Design a protein around this ligand. Sequence first.
Ligand SMILES: [Ca+2]
Ligand SMILES: [Ca+2]
Ligand SMILES: [Ca+2]
Ligand SMILES: [Ca+2]
Ligand SMILES: [Ca+2]
Ligand SMILES: [Ca+2]
Lengths: 48, 113
Amino acid sequence: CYGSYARPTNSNGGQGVMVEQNGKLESQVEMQFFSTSTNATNEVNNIQ
Amino acid sequence: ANTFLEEVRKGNLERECVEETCSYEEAFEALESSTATDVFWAKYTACETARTPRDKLAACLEGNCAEGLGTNYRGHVNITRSGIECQLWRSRYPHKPEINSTTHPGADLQENF
Ligand SMILES: [Ca+2]
Ligand SMILES: [Ca+2]
Ligand SMILES: [Ca+2]
Ligand SMILES: [Ca+2]
Ligand SMILES: [Ca+2]
Ligand SMILES: [Ca+2]
């Protein structure tokens, strides 16, 4: 973390490599989910 | 186990080896009474299916119910399913048990329970 920089790309200060695909409008950012392993690691119920 | 700075605070047998997957070391550390330590271990082992939730482990500590095949039961019922008197596990009357007190001392073999 000490001394690391990443220039802004969007208008209101959001970093992220805006790649171009039929237009630079595309800007890929993915979402990943996580739950408590030790919930029990075992729940017949659909984990949240 | 988790909350790393737990080893500097005082601890709770229930805030380490109950509400959390614990080391028998912290269990050993907190218990020392190695007889009840074996008891708590026996618990843990039998309660291997009673690890979660918390109140399930509390009941498995109570021990009134047999877990699975009945390794953990510690009640006072000493009668067969059909009312026949239970023979003393250690005694050889009327049968000499190959499986008895010497072979299974960790089950807390009572009079005829
Ligand atoms: Ca802990
Ligand atoms: Ca710990
Ligand atoms: Ca905690
Ligand atoms: Ca410790
Ligand atoms: Ca501790
Ligand atoms: Ca608690």
